[PDB]
Design a binder for this molecule. Structure first.
Ligand SMILES: *[C@@H]1O[C@H](CO)[C@@H](O)[C@H](O)[C@H]1NC(C)=O
Lengths: 49, 50
């Protein structure tokens, strides 16, 4: 256990960094998708209705 | 101005709008015209005179 908490620390840091990167990219992509959905709603109101 | 965009500034035919300040934002009061009390009639594309 004394020497197993240093490699596990590296694994934790790497996996946390991967998760944070995924969440950030997904947030940006979700912002883009929200803009596209707002455009779709505007087209539905202005043109279909 | 008065907008012809559908549902851009309220449900109905837009008449006018009033802005109000609010904490960290704006509040639009959209005054719009809504038809009501419909009645059914017989219609025709055109009327044939002589
Ligand atoms: C007649 O008009 C009423 C509203 O006044 C409407 O609900 C109804 O469908 C109409 N009747 C018909 C189309 O037979």
């Amino acid at each position: 256990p004394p020497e197993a908490e240093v490699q596990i620390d590296r694994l934790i840091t790497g996996r946390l960094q991967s998760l944070q990167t995924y969440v950030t990219q997904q947030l940006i992509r979700a912002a883009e998708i929200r803009a596209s959905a707002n455009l779709a709603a505007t087209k539905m109101s202005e043109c279909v209705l | 101005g008065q907008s012809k965009r559908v549902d851009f500034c309220g449900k109905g035919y837009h008449l006018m709008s009033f802005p109000q300040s609010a904490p960290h934002g704006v509040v639009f009061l959209h005054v719009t015209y809504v038809p009501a009390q419909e009645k059914n009639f017989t219609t025709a594309p055109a009327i044939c005179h002589d």
